[PDB]
Amino acid sequence: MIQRTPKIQVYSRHPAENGKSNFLNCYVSGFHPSDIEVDLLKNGERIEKVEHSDLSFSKDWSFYLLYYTEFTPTEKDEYACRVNHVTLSQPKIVKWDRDM
Amino acid sequence: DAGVIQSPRHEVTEMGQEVTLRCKPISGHNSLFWYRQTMMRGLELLIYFNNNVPIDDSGMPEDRFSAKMPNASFSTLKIQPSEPRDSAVYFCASTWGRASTDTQYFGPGTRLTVLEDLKNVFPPEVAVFEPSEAEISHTQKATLVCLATGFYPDHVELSWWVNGKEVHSGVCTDPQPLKEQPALNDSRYALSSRLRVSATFWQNPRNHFRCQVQFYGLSENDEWTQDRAKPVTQIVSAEAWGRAD
Amino acid sequence: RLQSLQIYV
Amino acid sequence: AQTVTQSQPEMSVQEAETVTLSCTYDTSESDYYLFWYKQPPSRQMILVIRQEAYKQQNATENRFSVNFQKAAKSFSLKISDSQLGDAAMYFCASSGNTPLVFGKGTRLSVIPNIQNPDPAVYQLRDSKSSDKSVCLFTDFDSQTNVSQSKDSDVYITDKCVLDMRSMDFKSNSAVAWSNKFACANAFNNS
Amino acid sequence: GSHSMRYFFTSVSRPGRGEPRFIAVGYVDDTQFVRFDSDAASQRMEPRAPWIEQEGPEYWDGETRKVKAHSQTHRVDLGTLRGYYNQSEAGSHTVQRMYGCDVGSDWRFLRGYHQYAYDGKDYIALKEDLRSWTAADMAAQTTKHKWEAAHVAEQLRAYLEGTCVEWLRRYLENGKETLQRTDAPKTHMTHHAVSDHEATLRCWALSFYPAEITLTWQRDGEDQTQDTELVETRPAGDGTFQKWAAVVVPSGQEQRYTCHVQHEGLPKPLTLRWE
C-alpha cells in the first residue's frame, strides 16, 4: 500500500480587504488514499456551510480537493484549515496568512 | 452440452403462482444476460451480470421480477406473482465478460405461458397415418403423416423417431397449429407433421416409425378438480411399422 | 461525452 | 440514443437467388459493434455475421455479406444462393450504451424451387385403428395457394416444404382430415 | 491553441460500509464541466460548467447511463483486483482510471490515452501508439491478455479518434468564451520583514488561465534557486489559478532580486523588482 501525506494551502480567492467579502480556500493535494477530513475554522470553530470540489488526481495518481466557503477577512478574525488523514499522527492545522 | 443451458424448455403456470427460470452459462464465461421475446415488444433486455454483479437492471419490470446470480455457474430469474402479461420466451445468453462488445451466446429459451386458469389445458392425442400405396407406386416415395389433436395451450414438441434415432431429414411440421373450433378463443389446437422416406425404406417391415409429441402441461403440485385425466406434462406417441405390401 | 464501451479488468 | 430499424417485417426470396435484408440504426458514439442474428423456428439465436465499426472492410461469411455504410448508418445483409434452411427471423443488432439491442426483425421465407411439379392428392389410413383417415396434397409447385376449410369440421393445413436431402429432392404438401369426406374433392377450393 | 478532454474515475471500496464510492469528473483543459458522485442524491451526471447546460435532456440521460455502468464495471474490477493480489476482504482499495484525447491548434486528433491504477500505483495503460498495452506487474499481464483477445485497444482507439475529439470540438465552440480565453496573470510583489536584517520577497501571480505558468527568481540578473520557496499552482475557486514564489533576502539587498513571470497570456515575460 502506498501512502502519501497531503499538502495544504490556505488562502483567499481575491486579495483580502478587511470588511470586504471574499472566499476562504483550503486546497489539499498530493495525498493517498482518498479518505480525507477537511474543516475550515473561524476562531477555532468548524464553519458550517463549507463546500468542496469533486475528487480528482494528478500524474502520480495522488488526489486533490478544494474546500471553500464565503468569508469576510478582518484584522483579528483568525481563519485556519484542519486536515485529517491516515498519514497524520493527528489533525494538521494551517493558519490563514493573508500574505500567503 | 457445452452451451447455455435453460431449465425448462417450456412451462405452463396459472396466474398468481410463482415462476423461477434457471440458466447456466457456457463454462469460462463470466457474464450472463436475460432477455424476453414477445410478439408485441420483440427482444427486450431484462438484466445482465458480470462476475455475478448486477450491471444493469433498467429493463426489469418494476415490481414482480427478481434475478440472482449466486455463483458463476447459474442464474435464476423469478416472477412473483405470475400474470398473463408475463407470458413470453425468456432467453439467457452468456459472454466471456471482457467487454460489452463480446459476442453473446444464446440459450434455447424458456417459453412461459401464464393462463388465467388451468381449466382449459388438454394433452394431445396422437395418430400416425401410413403412406398411400398410390403415392408409393406413382413416386417411389412414401409420406407418413402424424396428427397431434385436441391440445391446449400451444406447448407441444413433435419429433419423429425411426428405429430409435430422432429424424430430421424428410420432416416438415406445420409452423402454426390450427383451431379445431376456430370460433372460440380457448379452442384446442391441432398440429400435423409429415415424414417422407423412399418407398423401399418404408417397404422394409423391420423399419420402425414413431411420432412422439412432448406436451408441457401441469405439474402434480398443481391442483386438479375436473372430470378427466389431469393434463400433466407428458409424452404421447403413435407408431407404425414398414409393410412389404 | 463518455465512452460507451465497458471493459473489465 | 440506441435504435435499430428493420423496415420490412416480411421478405421472400426464391431458392438459390439472393436477397438483401435492410437495417438502419442510430448510435450516439463511435465505439460500437454491429451484428446480424438468425433465429430458426427452433428459436435458437445464432450469430450470422459481425461488423466492428472501427474496421473498414465489409464483413463476409461464406454466402453472407454486409453492405456496411457507416456515414449512412446502414448495415444491410446480403444472402446469396439462398437455401430453404435460410428461412428464419433475422435480427439486426448493435452494441452501445446497452451491450445488445435488437431491431424488430425480418421474417425471410424461401420459396422452394419445385423442379418437377407432380400435383396429387392421396389418402392415408390410420396405423392402429383404420376408421380414421387423412388426405395428403403433395408435390405441387410453390406458386400454389392452399385454401382454408369451408366445411367448419374439415381441417386443412397450410403448405409445408420438406427436404429429402439424401435424394436431393424437395416437395410441398398440405394435410386435411375430418370425422366423416373424400380426398378427391377435399382440396377443390384450393 | 491545443486542447484536451479528460475523464477521471475514482472508485473506493469500503468493506462493510456500503457499495464502493464512485466519483467521475470531466475536464476540458483546466476547466471541470461534468460530475457524478455515487453518494450524491441526484444519481445523475450533473453539469459543472454553464456551457454544458445547453445540452439536451437526452444527452444527460445518456451520460448518466454510461457513467452508472462505469461505476459497476469498477465495482467488479475491485473484486477482480482483490483476487489478483490475494488480498483480504477487510481492506479498502482504490481503482483509478483516466482517459482522454488531445487536439492540436487545428483541432485535429493528436494523442490519446487510457490508464488504470490500483491502490495508487500503475496497473495497465494504453501505449502512445494506441495498439499495445503497458502492464505494470504480472497481475496486470492477465488483463493485458483478456483485452488483447477482445481487441480492446482497437475499440478504445475508435472512441479516442472519434467521439472524443468530435465532442471536444463541440465543447470548445459551446464554451468559446470560457475555454478559449487566456487570462494573463495579475502580478505584484510583497515584502515581509522576518528579522530586523532579513526580509521575504514574495512574487504573486493571480487570476490567470490556463494554469501553466513559470515563476523564477534572479539575483543581479542571474538565476537563483537557493533560498527560494515555490508553492504549487492552486485554483482560485472561480476558474482561475494562483501561484507565488518567495526568496528570503538580507535587508538592504532587496533591489538585487528580480522575479520573472512567464505565461502564455503575456505578450512578453514580466520582470518585477522591489520598489
Side-chain angles (χ1 to χ4, degrees), chain A residues 1-19 21-45 47-48 50-58 60-100, chain B residues 1-8 10-39 41-118 120-245, chain C, chain D residues 1-56 58-103 105-127 129-179 181-190, chain E residues 1-18 20-176 178-275:
Chain A
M1 280 290 345
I2 89 178
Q3 284 194 329
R4 303 180 178 294
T5 324
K7 318 202 211 70
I8 318 169
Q9 297 196 65
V10 185
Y11 59 100
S12 57
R13 168 180 306 173
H14 309 272
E17 311 204 1
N18 287 335
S21 149
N22 209 330
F23 279 86
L24 180 65
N25 288 332
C26 185
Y27 176 70
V28 279
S29 58
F31 58 94
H32 212 295
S34 67
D35 311 76
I36 202 161
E37 194 169 54
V38 184
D39 308 289
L40 300 190
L41 312 177
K42 168 190 185 159
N43 299 320
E45 308 162 26
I47 307 182
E48 49 276 79
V50 173
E51 289 183 277
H52 69 78
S53 63
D54 304 299
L55 194 62
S56 188
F57 49 84
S58 322
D60 63 353
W61 302 106
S62 67
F63 297 109
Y64 62 79
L65 287 166
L66 189 66
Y67 291 76
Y68 55 101
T69 194
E70 294 237 41
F71 87 133
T72 294
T74 90
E75 177 77 1
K76 304 270 185 123
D77 273 350
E78 267 179 55
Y79 296 89
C81 179
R82 201 185 39 216
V83 183
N84 194 42
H85 189 257
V86 77
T87 45
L88 298 185
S89 324
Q90 78 251 12
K92 190 134 89 214
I93 305 205
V94 174
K95 284 141 150 164
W96 176 51
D97 189 327
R98 77 185 64 221
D99 310 315
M100 317 189 164
Chain B
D1 183 28
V4 170
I5 306 305
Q6 281 207 259
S7 96
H10 301 242
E11 212 208 329
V12 200
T13 56
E14 179 182 17
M15 96 183 286
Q17 296 311 319
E18 199 201 36
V19 173
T20 321
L21 319 166
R22 201 176 150 105
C23 168
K24 185 254 229 176
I26 287 165
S27 206
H29 284 196
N30 279 319
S31 189
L32 189 150
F33 296 69
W34 285 99
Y35 300 88
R36 81 172 152 180
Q37 189 172 25
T38 57
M39 271 144 29
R41 275 161 293 121
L43 276 151
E44 289 185 319
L45 171 62
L46 280 173
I47 188 179
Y48 66 104
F49 305 74
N50 183 299
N51 264 237
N52 318 320
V53 182
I55 305 300
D56 180 345
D57 67 331
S58 304
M60 285 281 271
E62 317 244 357
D63 262 311
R64 291 186 325 300
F65 284 54
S66 156
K68 282 186 292 122
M69 176 141 200
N71 58 84
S73 58
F74 82 99
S75 179
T76 73
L77 162 72
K78 205 180 63 50
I79 309 188
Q80 194 140 32
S82 48
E83 302 180 0
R85 58 173 161 149
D86 298 335
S87 292
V89 191
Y90 286 87
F91 288 103
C92 177
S94 69
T95 77
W96 287 107
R98 297 153 327 188
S100 53
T101 43
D102 282 348
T103 294
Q104 307 214 340
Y105 298 93
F106 278 77
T110 289
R111 47 170 319 219
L112 172 96
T113 38
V114 185
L115 296 172
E116 262 171 76
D117 60 82
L118 313 179
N120 204 81
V121 178
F122 292 88
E125 266 159 341
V126 173
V128 159
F129 300 83
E130 311 198 336
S132 155
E133 259 289 342
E135 184 212 8
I136 296 170
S137 98
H138 182 65
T139 69
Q140 283 164 89
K141 308 173 191 55
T143 297
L144 293 95
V145 169
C146 180
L147 272 191
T149 41
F151 60 98
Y152 185 90
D154 180 7
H155 272 256
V156 290
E157 294 277 278
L158 192 163
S159 55
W160 286 95
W161 292 75
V162 172
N163 305 324
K165 317 247 183 300
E166 174 165 13
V167 181
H168 320 275
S169 175
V171 172
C172 200
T173 300
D174 291 332
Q176 315 286 327
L178 52 77
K179 297 199 154 185
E180 313 194 314
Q181 299 290 8
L184 293 55
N185 184 67
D186 314 314
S187 149
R188 299 148 72 179
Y189 294 138
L191 187 83
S192 87
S193 178
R194 320 104 176 93
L195 165 70
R196 199 162 206 189
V197 297
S198 69
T200 55
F201 190 88
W202 163 255
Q203 271 163 9
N204 177 345
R206 298 201 66 170
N207 282 330
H208 176 48
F209 305 81
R210 184 173 62 90
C211 175
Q212 159 186 306
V213 178
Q214 170 81 66
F215 168 74
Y216 290 91
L218 303 200
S219 214
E220 253 132 342
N221 287 335
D222 286 306
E223 321 260 14
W224 196 242
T225 84
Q226 310 259 316
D227 196 1
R228 58 186 175 88
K230 204 174 176 172
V232 289
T233 286
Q234 63 186 282
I235 295 173
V236 187
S237 267
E239 35 176 55
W241 272 269
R243 68 190 288 107
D245 213 306
Chain C
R1 208 108 226 250
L2 281 166
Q3 83 168 352
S4 209
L5 166 67
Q6 293 305 336
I7 62 181
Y8 296 81
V9 86
Chain D
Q2 186 177 3
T3 56
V4 175
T5 301
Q6 282 175 270
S7 276
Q8 257 291 16
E10 301 271 27
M11 294 216 78
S12 267
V13 64
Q14 293 279 359
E15 183 177 15
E17 303 214 48
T18 89
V19 62
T20 297
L21 271 41
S22 88
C23 178
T24 48
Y25 61 94
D26 295 314
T27 206
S28 311
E29 287 95 21
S30 41
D31 54 346
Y32 59 98
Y33 279 19
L34 290 186
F35 304 92
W36 276 98
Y37 277 83
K38 179 206 213 194
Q39 201 187 23
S42 99
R43 274 179 240 115
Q44 245 290 6
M45 297 276 279
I46 313 131
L47 175 75
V48 174
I49 191 150
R50 183 177 65 146
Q51 180 74 40
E52 309 102 307
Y54 68 83
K55 264 220 191 212
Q56 283 174 90
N58 274 331
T60 41
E61 278 314 327
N62 55 94
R63 4 167 238 133
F64 294 99
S65 63
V66 299
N67 187 24
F68 178 40
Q69 272 168 333
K70 211 182 179 176
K73 271 154 220 234
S74 203
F75 187 62
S76 54
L77 172 61
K78 199 173 84 184
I79 316 179
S80 58
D81 189 52
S82 72
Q83 318 195 328
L84 309 168
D86 296 322
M89 290 279 313
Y90 291 81
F91 285 109
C92 194
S94 71
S95 267
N97 314 323
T98 304
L100 252 198
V101 185
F102 295 97
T106 300
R107 187 152 66 159
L108 180 60
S109 324
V110 187
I111 306 135
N113 191 24
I114 293 316
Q115 334 166 316
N116 254 293
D118 200 359
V121 167
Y122 306 107
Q123 192 194 113
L124 291 64
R125 229 28 121 64
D126 166 332
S127 79
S129 93
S130 100
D131 260 315
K132 319 216 296 337
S133 91
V134 317
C135 304
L136 170 68
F137 172 42
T138 173
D139 295 353
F140 48 89
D141 62 20
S142 310
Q143 303 86 331
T144 293
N145 308 307
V146 178
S147 68
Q148 312 268 341
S149 184
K150 311 209 168 283
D151 162 277
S152 321
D153 206 280
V154 168
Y155 309 101
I156 311 183
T157 78
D158 194 30
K159 66 186 144 173
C160 205
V161 50
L162 65 87
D163 188 17
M164 307 174 72
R165 185 72 300 140
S166 194
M167 296 193 359
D168 185 46
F169 177 81
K170 308 163 184 78
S171 52
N172 300 321
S173 75
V175 176
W177 68 101
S178 216
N179 275 277
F181 185 69
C183 304
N185 234 32
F187 303 86
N188 63 351
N189 6 124
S190 199
Chain E
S2 94
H3 307 264
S4 73
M5 169 160 73
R6 291 168 170 145
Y7 284 99
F8 300 67
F9 309 88
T10 305
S11 212
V12 191
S13 72
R14 29 205 183 165
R17 298 180 188 179
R21 185 150 196 221
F22 179 77
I23 282 156
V25 178
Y27 282 95
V28 172
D29 308 316
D30 295 328
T31 297
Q32 181 186 5
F33 73 94
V34 283
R35 169 238 180 172
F36 179 90
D37 187 333
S38 96
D39 289 6
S42 93
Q43 291 300 305
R44 304 261 306 173
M45 186 71 117
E46 304 165 21
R48 274 322 163 87
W51 46 268
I52 209 64
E53 298 227 63
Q54 66 183 256
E55 301 295 348
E58 307 230 60
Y59 172 98
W60 297 104
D61 299 334
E63 296 307 294
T64 303
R65 287 178 59 98
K66 291 186 302 193
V67 74
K68 300 226 278 167
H70 276 74
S71 164
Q72 289 321 281
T73 89
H74 276 226
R75 186 155 104 221
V76 167
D77 286 341
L78 273 159
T80 308
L81 280 156
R82 184 181 58 64
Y84 285 178
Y85 288 101
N86 270 100
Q87 315 195 294
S88 100
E89 295 199 36
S92 175
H93 297 256
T94 301
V95 159
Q96 270 160 277
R97 175 172 135 129
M98 191 272 308
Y99 70 64
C101 43
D102 284 345
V103 299
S105 84
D106 50 25
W107 291 12
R108 308 269 267 232
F109 177 92
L110 172 73
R111 178 196 196 235
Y113 26 93
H114 199 110
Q115 341 233 327
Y116 264 84
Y118 177 58
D119 280 344
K121 303 143 14 238
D122 270 0
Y123 181 73
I124 195 160
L126 203 59
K127 284 179 121 69
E128 285 271 327
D129 79 334
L130 308 182
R131 315 224 308 134
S132 325
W133 298 93
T134 289
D137 49 17
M138 280 279 254
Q141 292 281 353
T142 299
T143 295
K144 204 195 81 197
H145 292 145
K146 281 179 45 139
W147 290 354
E148 266 167 338
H151 290 273
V152 167
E154 288 82 329
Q155 288 172 77
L156 304 179
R157 190 181 179 153
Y159 161 83
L160 300 184
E161 296 178 4
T163 289
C164 195
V165 305
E166 95 158 70
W167 278 79
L168 176 52
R169 300 186 270 254
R170 177 206 176 59
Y171 295 154
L172 281 180
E173 304 174 320
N174 290 357
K176 196 192 127 293
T178 300
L179 292 175
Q180 316 213 27
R181 75 206 214 277
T182 42
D183 291 355
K186 300 187 175 102
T187 59
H188 73 280
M189 191 174 307
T190 63
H191 174 285
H192 319 266
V194 18
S195 89
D196 324 59
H197 321 67
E198 274 58 61
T200 302
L201 287 180
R202 185 156 282 112
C203 186
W204 288 83
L206 296 167
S207 265
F208 55 99
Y209 187 89
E212 177 52 58
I213 198 166
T214 294
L215 299 188
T216 73
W217 273 106
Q218 275 181 9
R219 175 213 227 194
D220 304 337
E222 203 151 308
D223 267 344
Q224 168 169 326
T225 82
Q226 166 201 318
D227 280 296
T228 66
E229 207 195 329
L230 213 58
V231 298
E232 70 163 282
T233 305
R234 52 205 204 190
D238 58 3
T240 68
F241 294 94
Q242 327 181 334
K243 194 188 184 65
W244 58 252
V247 64
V248 284
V249 155
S251 167
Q253 305 198 28
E254 291 76 332
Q255 242 71 154
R256 306 178 68 176
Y257 298 89
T258 47
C259 168
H260 301 269
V261 182
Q262 307 178 258
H263 185 275
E264 85 192 64
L266 292 171
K268 292 166 187 273
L270 302 181
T271 290
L272 284 91
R273 191 183 310 262
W274 185 234
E275 276 155 23

